[PDB]
Write an enzyme that holds these catalytic residues in place. Sequence first.
Site, PDB file in Angstrom:
ATOM      1  N   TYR A 510       0.656  -0.959   0.079  1.00 51.46           N
ATOM      2  CA  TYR A 510       0.037   0.012  -0.137  1.00 51.46           C
ATOM      3  C   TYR A 510       1.023   1.319   0.120  1.00 51.46           C
ATOM      4  CZ  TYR A 510      -3.243   3.482   0.771  1.00 51.46           C
ATOM      5  OH  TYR A 510      -4.052   4.798   0.648  1.00 51.46           O
ATOM      6  N   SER A 593      -5.188   0.721  -5.231  1.00 50.25           N
ATOM      7  CA  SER A 593      -5.123   2.150  -5.334  1.00 50.25           C
ATOM      8  C   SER A 593      -3.726   2.697  -5.129  1.00 50.25           C
ATOM      9  CB  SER A 593      -6.046   2.434  -3.999  1.00 50.25           C
ATOM     10  OG  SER A 593      -6.445   3.934  -4.172  1.00 50.25           O
ATOM     11  N   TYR A 594      -3.265   3.130  -3.979  1.00 47.28           N
ATOM     12  CA  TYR A 594      -2.122   3.586  -3.570  1.00 47.28           C
ATOM     13  C   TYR A 594      -1.112   2.458  -3.867  1.00 47.28           C
ATOM     14  CZ  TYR A 594       1.603   6.982  -2.225  1.00 47.28           C
ATOM     15  OH  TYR A 594       2.633   7.986  -2.480  1.00 47.28           O
ATOM     16  N   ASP A 671     -15.755   3.920 -11.198  1.00 44.70           N
ATOM     17  CA  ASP A 671     -14.657   4.452  -9.921  1.00 44.70           C
ATOM     18  C   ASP A 671     -14.594   5.752 -10.036  1.00 44.70           C
ATOM     19  OD1 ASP A 671     -12.307   5.226  -8.340  1.00 44.70           O
ATOM     20  OD2 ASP A 671     -11.681   3.013  -8.733  1.00 44.70           O
ATOM     21  N   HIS A 703     -14.521   1.992  -6.738  1.00 45.66           N
ATOM     22  CA  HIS A 703     -13.146   1.942  -5.997  1.00 45.66           C
ATOM     23  C   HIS A 703     -13.007   0.646  -5.356  1.00 45.66           C
ATOM     24  CE1 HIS A 703      -9.103   3.139  -5.700  1.00 45.66           C
ATOM     25  NE2 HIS A 703      -9.046   3.319  -4.426  1.00 45.66           N
TER      26      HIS A 703
END
Lengths: 729, 729
Positions: A510, A593-594, A671, A703
Amino acid sequence: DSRKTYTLTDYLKNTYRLKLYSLRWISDHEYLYKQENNILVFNAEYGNSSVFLENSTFDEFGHSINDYSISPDGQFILLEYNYVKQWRHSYTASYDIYDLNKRQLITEERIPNNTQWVTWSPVGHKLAYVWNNDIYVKIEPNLPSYRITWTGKEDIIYNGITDWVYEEEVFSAYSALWWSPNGTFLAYAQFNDTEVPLIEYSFYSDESLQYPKTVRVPYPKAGAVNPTVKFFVVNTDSLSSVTNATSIQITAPASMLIGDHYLCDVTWATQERISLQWLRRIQNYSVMDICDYDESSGRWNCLVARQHIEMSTTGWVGRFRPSEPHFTLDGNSFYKIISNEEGYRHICYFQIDKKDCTFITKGTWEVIGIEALTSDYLYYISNEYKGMPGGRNLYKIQLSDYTKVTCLSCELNPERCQYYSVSFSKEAKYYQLRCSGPGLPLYTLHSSVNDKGLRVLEDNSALDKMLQNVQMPSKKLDFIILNETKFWYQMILPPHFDKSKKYPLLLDVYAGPCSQKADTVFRLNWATYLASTENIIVASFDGRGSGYQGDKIMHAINRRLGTFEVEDQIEAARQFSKMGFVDNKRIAIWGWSYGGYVTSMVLGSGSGVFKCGIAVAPVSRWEYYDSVYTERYMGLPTPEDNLDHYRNSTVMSRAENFKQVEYLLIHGTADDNVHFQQSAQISKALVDVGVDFQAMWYTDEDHGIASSTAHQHIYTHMSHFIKQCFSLP
Amino acid sequence: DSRKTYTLTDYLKNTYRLKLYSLRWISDHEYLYKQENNILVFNAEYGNSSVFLENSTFDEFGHSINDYSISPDGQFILLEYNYVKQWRHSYTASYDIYDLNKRQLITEERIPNNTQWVTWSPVGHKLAYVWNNDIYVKIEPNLPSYRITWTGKEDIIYNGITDWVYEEEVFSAYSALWWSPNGTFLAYAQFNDTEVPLIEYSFYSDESLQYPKTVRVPYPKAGAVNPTVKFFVVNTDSLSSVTNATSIQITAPASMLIGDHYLCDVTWATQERISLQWLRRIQNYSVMDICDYDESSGRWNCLVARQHIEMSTTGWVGRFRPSEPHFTLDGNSFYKIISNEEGYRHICYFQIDKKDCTFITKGTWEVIGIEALTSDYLYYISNEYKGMPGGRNLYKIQLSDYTKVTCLSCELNPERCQYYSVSFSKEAKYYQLRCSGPGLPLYTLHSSVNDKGLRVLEDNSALDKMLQNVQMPSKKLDFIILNETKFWYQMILPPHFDKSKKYPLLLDVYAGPCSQKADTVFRLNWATYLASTENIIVASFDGRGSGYQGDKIMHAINRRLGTFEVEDQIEAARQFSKMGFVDNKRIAIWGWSYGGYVTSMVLGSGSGVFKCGIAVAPVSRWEYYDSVYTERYMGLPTPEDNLDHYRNSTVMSRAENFKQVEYLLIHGTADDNVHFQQSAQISKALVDVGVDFQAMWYTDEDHGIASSTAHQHIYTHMSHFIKQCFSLP
Ligand SMILES: *[C@@H]1O[C@H](CO)[C@@H](O[C@@H]2O[C@H](CO)[C@@H](O)[C@H](O)[C@H]2NC(C)=O)[C@H](O)[C@H]1NC(C)=O
Ligand SMILES: *[C@@H]1O[C@H](CO)[C@@H](O[C@@H]2O[C@H](CO)[C@@H](O)[C@H](O)[C@H]2NC(C)=O)[C@H](O)[C@H]1NC(C)=O
Ligand SMILES: *[C@@H]1O[C@H](CO)[C@@H](O[C@@H]2O[C@H](CO)[C@@H](O)[C@H](O)[C@H]2NC(C)=O)[C@H](O)[C@H]1NC(C)=O
Ligand SMILES: *[C@@H]1O[C@H](CO)[C@@H](O[C@@H]2O[C@H](CO)[C@@H](O)[C@H](O)[C@H]2NC(C)=O)[C@H](O)[C@H]1NC(C)=O
Ligand SMILES: *[C@@H]1O[C@H](CO)[C@@H](O[C@@H]2O[C@H](CO)[C@@H](O)[C@H](O)[C@H]2NC(C)=O)[C@H](O)[C@H]1NC(C)=O
Ligand SMILES: *[C@@H]1O[C@H](CO[C@@H]2O[C@@H](C)[C@@H](O)[C@@H](O)[C@@H]2O)[C@@H](O)[C@H](O)[C@H]1NC(C)=O
Ligand SMILES: *[C@@H]1O[C@H](CO[C@@H]2O[C@@H](C)[C@@H](O)[C@@H](O)[C@@H]2O)[C@@H](O)[C@H](O)[C@H]1NC(C)=O
Ligand SMILES: *[C@@H]1O[C@H](CO)[C@@H](O)[C@H](O)[C@H]1NC(C)=O
Ligand SMILES: *[C@@H]1O[C@H](CO)[C@@H](O)[C@H](O)[C@H]1NC(C)=O
Ligand SMILES: *[C@@H]1O[C@H](CO)[C@@H](O)[C@H](O)[C@H]1NC(C)=O
Ligand SMILES: *[C@@H]1O[C@H](CO)[C@@H](O)[C@H](O)[C@H]1NC(C)=O
Ligand SMILES: *[C@@H]1O[C@H](CO)[C@@H](O)[C@H](O)[C@H]1NC(C)=O
């Protein structure tokens, strides 16, 4: 060992379910608990209970009730149905008020359908709700509502509710209204998104929709026009006396008005004193105003002598935003978690009219949050115990003697419990402790007067029994030293882990700012199955940029996302190799995501360490993400500020290096957070340099890609890819 | 064999190129031909030539010229540049006119930028162009333009140009302008899309675009509101600079005005006679109007006695629309291809003042098109030779004795040439023959008087020399009999084909109404590589619904798309699998667009015959496709018409049956033809039933997925998929 392993189907079907114990304090003595579809009320002190609301009360209601909400005075219950989710916190619903005393449903002057937000007053049974972007107040549940605002306008003017960016990045809530302690005043924020650009994308809906719908959302990307905000306070007690009660505005400080800014915190101190915190678009400077009601002028004045400034020289302010103040009953002083001179976040005590605060805690660890405050004690959570940044324990500190600090959870069960969260009763007379690891979750009730454990609420004995017949993986939590600095990591090791063997390794990443992927929490997830069934070692590492370890580490990636946190994950992979029990030829990496961004940046680094990787809904270019979050760490994407690094930290520029790896790119088409656009640009970049890769879009998923079917489909798809990448000849 | 094979790179890099010989007839004796950038003029009788335009003439032009258009009199040349493609035929560009007399480019009254269409008059050098949806005329290249229409409005009113659906499904052209034979009159159509819904989809553009753009195109899906149409004729000889030109409207027949209809054909008969064909929305009834200019009133009259009706009781009218009429010199009669009583398309001879036409050709074969007409002969292309539907030759029929039919290409070179197209000079004095298979393309020039073969223009001997050093595949064209009926198929066989061996087989399918995938054409494509390098047999089959074999076969799928054409592909594969040289364990199927739909319908039929399949930009539900094409074969999606079959012929309903097959779904996100929506719905249905599959989206690519990089990437991705599917475990 002939025991079954924890399979993918186990995870996707939730065969092994963690039991929870969610209670709702309705006073300093009792709480509501849902059991057998009916609402029970429990006496904290003795554990005895009664049927608060029979599960058969609303069988002929005609609608499936999504949730309940009892008024503070227990006289009414707010029934919520027709729930329709919007973003992470927002949603619309229908509401019916039920009179618990008259055991009858209210059918007059009902809360309208498609209501955006509704909340009871802190005391009594007043109601404030937002409908069609305007605020309404009901003094009595069966009486007509008083309209408070007339400016409401879809996607343009938001009264009492936040717009997209404020909901997600500022308040982590859809509501933008705050009742005063006894309910006399109703404060609220008003957002104007008139000039905020719109993100637009298609929504296909059910097969029956002939033409796709175009969803449009006011969403400011990095450097774009932000929404503006105003703050107001209205006296609800005067509503029935005047035709149109005036909303008194409290303007932001001049230090804020000079440019773009945000309203980042709202917290009442007393019945006639409210504190507000503002933040500059350049998030390293915040101002807190403390305003009192002037009964003679009917205005709210904020004395500069009570204005507090909070800035940062090494990074942004706060972990994700300026911390909230916790006021003493009289409202003349407050406690606030702030970074000390050493860069560690600790509790500082403030007198409202003195600019220098006094730290009441200190050390090379951090206070996670302030949970409760009484006239004699302040209870907080921190990771001080055993110097484990990934652990959480409840502490009690004597206000009359700061040297008196007791850890209320550390030794309750040291082997099974190292991560706690707590829930205090109305006046902190009792508290429920929630242990979430390293062992199975354990829920307990305690009395504050003597800090004695009252009883076990849920120990997950049933689940424990089941897991006995399964070859569960183990978790190793430790650290590695880099540049004389300690960096933690965890590894979900397969059953019968043998250090003399070589296992394939998957790097679960992450790595966002202030993130923490190495902790003592027990989880039943995809990694469980990978370690258990596929004998894969799933590791995670907290490098530079990670939180809860002081600003030196957290602010290390300030104005430089896409560097140190990326490099460190790679170094972590090399380190694990040196450990000897890792098949260097089979190291993969994945993240959401990140995590998808870091995964992609790593896969395109050309390090040669990773064989394959999976990026789910990754960010690919910071100018594509929102302003509040992005600018906090990256500043502005302009020549005079930080445009160069903005343009140098994209996934697209590393496209050529993807020829050395196997890549799977996944993204939901609907998203609203990390727009499909981000992956659409990655794919186009890879196509342009002639790089083959795997892809998967999830129609109408956002998302979270969390719909039941999509969830099962994505993890199934990813499993095949991982197994294929690690398959041996 | 030590020779190289035809590889994937050979295909992608165009290593082996077919030479062409595109000429432009400027008279009945000469033609233009671009050779090495310089435009040459050729004398057909002798073959001698001269330079018409030096390739260095515009070295300092400052713009890369996209194309040239020499006026009919050869006095001027239109230079096209700044070409920006829109749909299949539409595009805008900038134009400059070069005066070949003054040897200089006109700088006065230049055609505006972003011009949507431009065309010289048939004779002389007048000009007509469309700009901002309005028509303009220039009697002289250096003179001011006369504005013809003033109602032009983007996406609403189209003057002289077609809207999306008319461009794609009716005229197969962006232009909606028709000059009279000598240029006196300029006829045009006007489309009104005011109430046509818009298809909306995102366009991401270059990485630098922070917010994706939303493209909006008026596109009528099945059953939706269609654009309306009006027809006008204006005299360009009587235009004034003081008053606005007067356009005379020619209204449609009353049998059309009673409801929704289309203008489907415009053809001038003489200097003062124009014919138009109108089609009802229910496309099994069309009418031809023959209108004469009334010099007295200056208006156009269409006598009802000169009205010709064309209907069909078994399906729609025409292959894709009513055929174009070919008028005689005096314009008193015309020839037109129409389906006869046996359901075979033949040439009928019409008298403008008579209702019954006379068929001049007949038999169990069809006339493909009328190519030229003189007072003694009518020249046409047909698949009569050897009863081969997939073959084509040029014939001439003596107008005074229909029993005298002569084939002019049949015996030129039977082994190498079985498929021809032709290009006649102005008065049919000469014709160029283009042989495209089964051997390498051969271009020849002939004289009509005694059908002499003058000379070979291009024989592709260079390519033949190159291919001799390659292990090229062969092509087998044959048939199988289904229910007493013959259906043709072709197989691209790998080199050194050995019938005593088993080869995997890929069924290359299209199967749309009136389609033909089994023919004698020579092609260098993906299949060539699959057979040559991977030793894969690539077969194609023309079952029910296919064209050029009579309506009994073509109309079989009337109002029933997604049934017999799908069933017949399965039957063909089932029969190919029983042949000794086919590995029944390795049979795949793939198709693009309509081929993707059939491929998907087949893979979800549960036949168990196919192991894997690839669908590119497939149609998935007919209500998602446009009205003109869809309704032609499906009628309207209403309970009273054909809704039930619209709902039963979707790919989505068969999702569960994909459980035992490997499926690859691909689609460009900017597809304006078959919207990404169609695949987005397929993926969602597969996810909903828990079926795993492969997917790939191509950012910003349209239906062609033809950009250089996207082209290489998609065929590379599909090659990996196929090889993997056929890999021997
Ligand atoms: C929201 O902000 C916009 C400015 O972006 C305000 O609109 C302006 O309002 C003034 C006063 O009526 C006009 O003179 C301007 O022409 C408006 N400009 C724009 C952008 O429309 C709007 O009034 C604000 N809304 C509220 C309720 O505060
Ligand atoms: C209550 O007071 C508000 C604030 O004065 C009124 O809103 C104004 O209404 C006028 C006329 O419609 C507008 O020109 C102003 O721009 C509005 N101001 C604001 C802040 O909204 C509102 O109309 C009043 N409501 C009633 C019932 O009288
Ligand atoms: C809630 O707090 C408000 C504000 O302190 C109270 O309202 C004030 O009450 C005092 C009397 O105690 C009056 O002199 C003021 O005129 C009131 N001002 C306001 C804000 O209206 C209110 O009484 C409190 N609620 C209760 C009754 O507990
Ligand atoms: C294009 O068609 C539209 C209708 O589809 C025409 O607009 C209508 O015009 C009449 C008379 O002016 C109005 O009564 C209708 O209300 C209009 N329809 C709409 C928009 O609802 C329009 O005039 C046509 N344009 C041209 C140039 O012919
Ligand atoms: C193109 O055809 C038109 C129509 O036949 C010709 O114009 C007509 O010329 C005659 C004289 O022979 C006039 O009586 C008519 O009034 C004209 N028709 C019109 C325009 O209304 C035109 O001359 C022909 N072009 C050429 C010169 O070949
Ligand atoms: C719970 O029970 C209460 C009474 O408890 C009894 O009396 C106290 C003083 C102790 O001796 C205890 O051991 C006895 O059981 C009730 O007053 C109360 O209303 C009950 N609460 C609920 C919600 O049922
Ligand atoms: C082609 O050549 C023409 C003259 O050709 C000569 O005369 C004819 C009658 C034959 O006898 C032929 O063999 C001779 O070579 C030119 O008049 C004509 O312009 C030329 N065409 C072009 C455009 O190059
Ligand atoms: C809410 O909407 C329903 C229709 O679905 C209607 O029957 C009901 O009366 C409405 N109630 C309110 C809040 O007005
Ligand atoms: C805040 O950030 C800006 C932009 O990087 C910088 O110029 C300014 O000095 C910083 N102010 C503080 C609080 O140090
Ligand atoms: C077309 O645009 C170019 C670029 O602005 C301009 O120089 C030129 O004059 C334009 N041509 C016409 C016909 O206006
Ligand atoms: C031609 O018609 C247009 C549109 O009505 C008008 O603007 C223009 O003035 C007319 N020209 C003249 C002067 O006749
Ligand atoms: C045309 O097709 C419709 C739809 O099936 C049918 O009802 C009608 O009878 C047909 N008319 C003709 C031209 O045969």
